[PDB]
C-alpha cells in the first residue's frame, strides 16, 4: 500500500481505560495488569473487557497508524465512534459502532456480524490501519508482511467522530501479558 503519508501520531486516552490497563508514560504502550491499578471510576472506562480509546478524534480526512501485536495471543484493533456503550457486554460490529480485526485462539477474524474468517499465512507483529472518512473506508495491513491487505470495511456509516480502538485480551492463559504498541513513524 502507499497510505504511510497520512500517518498520524496516536496516543492512548488514560480515562477511557479499563481499570486493569497500565498505560506507559508516553502514552504509547497498554497492557493488561494482573490487578485493579487504583484508579477511581467513571463513566467513560470500559467496565467488562480489557480495552481503551486513543484521544485523537476524526471527522474527515485519510488517517493512517501502526500497532506491534509481538507475542499476543489474543486482542482487537481498529476504529470505533465516539459513543460506543462503555458498560456491560456487548459484541463489536458496525452496528454497535465498531470497526475492528481480532486474534483469537490461533484464528484471526473481522468484526463483522457475523465476524468473518481472515486468510493470513505469515501472522502479523505489526498491524497497518488505514482510515478514509469521506469513502466510508477503513482497512487493515499485515507490516510483516510487505503491507498486505487483511481487510477492508466499505461502505462504512461511521456516524459520529471516530477514535482509534484498542484491546489488549485477557490474560486467563499467562501466555497473553505482552503489551500493545503504538509504532513510531
Ligand atoms: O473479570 C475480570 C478479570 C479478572 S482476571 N481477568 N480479568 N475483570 C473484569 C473486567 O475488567 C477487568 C477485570
Ligand atoms: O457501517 C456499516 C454498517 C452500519 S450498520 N451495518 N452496516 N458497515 C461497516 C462496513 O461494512 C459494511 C457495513
Known sequence: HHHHHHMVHITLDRNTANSWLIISKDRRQVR????????????????????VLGAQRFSSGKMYWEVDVTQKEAWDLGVCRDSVQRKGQFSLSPENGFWTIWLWQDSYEAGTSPQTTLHIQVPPCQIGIFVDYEAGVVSFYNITDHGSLIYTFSECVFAGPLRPFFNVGFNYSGGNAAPLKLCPL
Open 32 to 51: 493488561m495488569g494482573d490487578t485493579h491499578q487504583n484508579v477511581s471510576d467513571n463513566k467513560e472506562r470500559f467496565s467488562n473487557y480489557p480495552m
